[PDB]
């Protein structure tokens, strides 16, 4: 028995209202639930590919995740805004942010439980994204 | 191997910067981790007593948790703002909100895995509380 995201099996999202819950549960699921429960949907295929958009924006995300202050959400957001400064973000920048946070969540997670740091990855993303960003990234999720 | 909140054993908080991280992990821990990790600190004793402040403000929190739309964070916040309308909240109202969300998280959680609803309880609280609220409730956590 392991956390099962609502959209785990989904190939697409219907409403744009599902966008925040979806990204949230994705990042939480990347903590540890991923190695016990898989998600074959086309939706989770797309999400995982955001790692590519992350690498494109942050260059080396492995070395970046290790460095960043995951104990401090506010400061992490400040660091991200070095790479993505504007409040108006592009669809690639938004994917990068989700991509980075999901990687951080996997890096910092335990095998069967989450950690303070892996949870904080979830809140860094929330800090970063506004409602206008959710409309845009929605276009990659159908 | 269960989630272990950073402040699980703590009797107090040192910095006001720990306040958001603490409440967050408390609410997550109320999902299911509470049955496998005991938190004897005076801090968690105080937090759990916020159920009293919840009952005081929302009358019957059991019947209220069942009714509310936990699938919809925005709407849950709207419902709460019926009871606590002002942006300037009192220390009792802030405790009520934490109290209610922790109860909701326990109600909706599974036995070994959180649920979409139990997680949403966490986000309802985040929706409700601003930084000025964290300074106030900090006075109950030392």
Residue numbers in the entry:
A (entry chain A), B (entry chain C): 8 to 149
What does the published report state?
Vaccinia virus, the vaccine used to eradicate smallpox, has about 200 genes, and many of these encode proteins that help the virus evade the host's immune defences. This paper concerns the vaccinia virus proteins A52 and B14, which block signalling pathways leading to the activation of the NF-κB transcription factor and thereby diminish the host immune response to infection. The structures of A52 and B14 are entirely α helical, both comprising seven α helices and adopting the Bcl-2–like fold. We show that both proteins are Bcl-2 family members but lack a surface groove for binding BH3 peptides and, consonant with this, are not anti-apoptotic. Instead these proteins have acquired the ability to inhibit signalling pathways that activate NF-κB.
VACV strain Western Reserve gene B14R is an immediate-early gene that encodes a 17-kDa cytosolic protein (B14) that contributes to VACV virulence and inhibits the IKK complex. The interaction of B14 with the IKK complex depends on the presence of IKKβ, and B14 bound to the IKK complex prevents phosphorylation of the IKKβ activation loop. The structure of SeMet B14 was refined to 2.7 Å resolution with residuals R/Rfree = 0.223/0.244, residues 8–149 being observed in the electron density. Four molecules of B14 are present in the crystallographic asymmetric unit, forming two dimers with highly conserved overall folds (0.11±0.02 Å rmsd over 142 Cα atoms) and dimer interfaces. Despite being a cytosolic protein, and despite being purified and crystallised in the presence of the reducing agent β-mercaptoethanol, a single disulphide bond is observed in B14 between cysteine residues 15 and 46, locking the N-terminal loop with the α1-α2 loop. There is no obvious functional role for this disulphide bond other than stabilising the structure of the protein. Superposition of our structures onto that of myxoma virus M11 in complex with the BH3 peptide of Bak reveals the hydrophobic BH3-peptide binding grooves are occluded in both A52 and B14, but not in N1. Equivalent residues (63–66 and 82–90) occlude the groove of B14, helices 2 and 4 again being much closer to each other than in M11 and three side chains (V64, F65 and Y90) pointing directly into and blocking the groove. However, only B14 is able to block signalling downstream of TNFα/TRAF2. This is due to the ability of B14 to inhibit signalling from the IKK complex via its interaction with IKKβ: the nexus where IL-1 receptor, TNF receptor and TLR signalling pathways to NF-κB converge.
